Design a protein around this ligand. Structure first.
Ligand code: HEM
Ligand code: HEM
Lengths: 11, 196, 196, 12
């Protein structure tokens, strides 16, 4: 949820 | 209702599914999350952490960073909250829509943070300190996170000492925001999950 | 299993009902809770808060006081936890019994706290600071608690700088334990409520 | 339940 946004923004 | 100011408004169309409500809400709050991540990448030493610890610090700390960044949404004087649309809403009306002690605690936090009269550079540096101070339970190399926090904390302490009267008391009050933020995070997460 | 060192043993007799296990456990941890309350009564100014606010601070802060007081149960060199029986159990053994990242975070907290090499006097004052800094979400008169906190925090700063005049960082390091304690409390409270 | 232990010990 939050994690997937963060992971994708980190690349 | 959805009485979180990351929303454009506290009002929810009753014809929408819970799924549609969340996807629209997610469109509102996702830019803010990504800006936290972009802020994290500009912290010296952050990208030198393992990817796991980076993701974990951000999972644990994104809310607290945003709480600091958006503390000025809470106008402690007129007791209004500014939602993402820019429209302001009274605490009375938000309490009538289901807000409670958490909202009250966020007004108190915002009032006390604003009283410190931090400059933009101090506020940024404090924001970095908040992120690297996030709950460590998920962290695999705590020494590396501790060293980042130590570096930023000393940078913040010297900045406050150089710029503020009664610097030691300002700095102490700034650090006492950290457990306050941890409690706000814990309560807010429970409300978030309750909403689903 | 009951992997909390407040219990006499992490082993749970399966012949006992859930109600019997909890009553036995309550006989073990109640004396530690009552000692926190008696400690609170000896804090100058704590009895001047309203009775509602006194109970809320103890409700929210008892675990964090006990975490500080019982940090010595965590032997960071041997990697053992002393349960109320006095018997020591290893990290590895507790991890096989389901203990997790929370246990590890208690080890790191106790290691860092022990490393500050506090006198009994500073440790006692720190513990009062920990209690009066508890989550203020319930609190009715936040100003009185905030005033009591600042009083004890000021006295702690003076005592530390008096006793550690060239190690100025100790006071900062002590303030940085409060968010760590708050995260220990958040996590532990989850595990506690899951047990019942 | 924690609160009951606390209130009892606090008034005693
Ligand atoms: C991605 C980040 C966030 C998400 C997903 C989120 C989501 C939510 C949800 C679903 C609720 C409950 C809504 C309801 O039950 O009506 C809530 C409550 C709330 N949130 Fe957020 N939120 C986020 C960040 C923030 C931030 C940064 C702040 C402060 C600047 C904030 C302030 C609040 C407030 C004041 C409430 C209501 C508290 C009360 O009930 O008294 N939220 N949030
Ligand atoms: C009134 C006080 C307390 C109560 C009622 C309590 C109760 C509990 C319960 C029911 C659990 C879950 C046990 C399990 O799932 O096996 C637990 C976990 C735990 N507690 Fe406590 N506890 C208290 C205070 C403390 C204190 C003061 C400490 C440390 C000084 C502590 C250390 C732990 C640890 C290490 C665990 C296991 C953590 C993990 O899963 O990694 N507890 N506690």
């Amino acid at each position: 949820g939050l994690e997937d946004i963060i992971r994708k923004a980190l690349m | 209702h959805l009485v979180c100011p990351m929303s454009k408004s506290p009002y929810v169309d009753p014809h929408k599914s819970g799924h549609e409500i969340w996807e629209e809400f997610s469109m509102s709050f996702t830019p803010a999350v990504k800006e936290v991540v972009e802020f994290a990448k500009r912290i010296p030493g952050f990208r030198d952490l393992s990817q796991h610890d980076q993701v974990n610090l951000l999972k644990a700390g994104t809310f607290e960073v945003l709480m600091v960044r958006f503390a000025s949404l809470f106008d402690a004087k007129e007791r209004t909250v500014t939602f993402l649309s820019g429209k302001k809403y009274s605490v009375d009306d938000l309490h009538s829509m289901g807000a409670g002690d958490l909202l009250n605690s966020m007004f108190e936090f915002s009032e006390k943070l604003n009283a410190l009269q931090l400059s933009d550079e101090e506020m940024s540096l404090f924001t970095a300190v908040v992120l690297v101070s996030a709950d460590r339970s998920g962290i695999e190399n705590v020494n590396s996170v501790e060293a980042l926090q130590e570096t930023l904390i000393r940078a913040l302490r010297t900045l406050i000492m150089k710029n503020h009267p009664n610097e030691a008391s300002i700095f102490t009050k700034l650090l006492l925001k950290l457990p306050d933020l941890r409690s706000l995070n814990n309560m807010h997460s429970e409300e978030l999950l309750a909403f689903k």
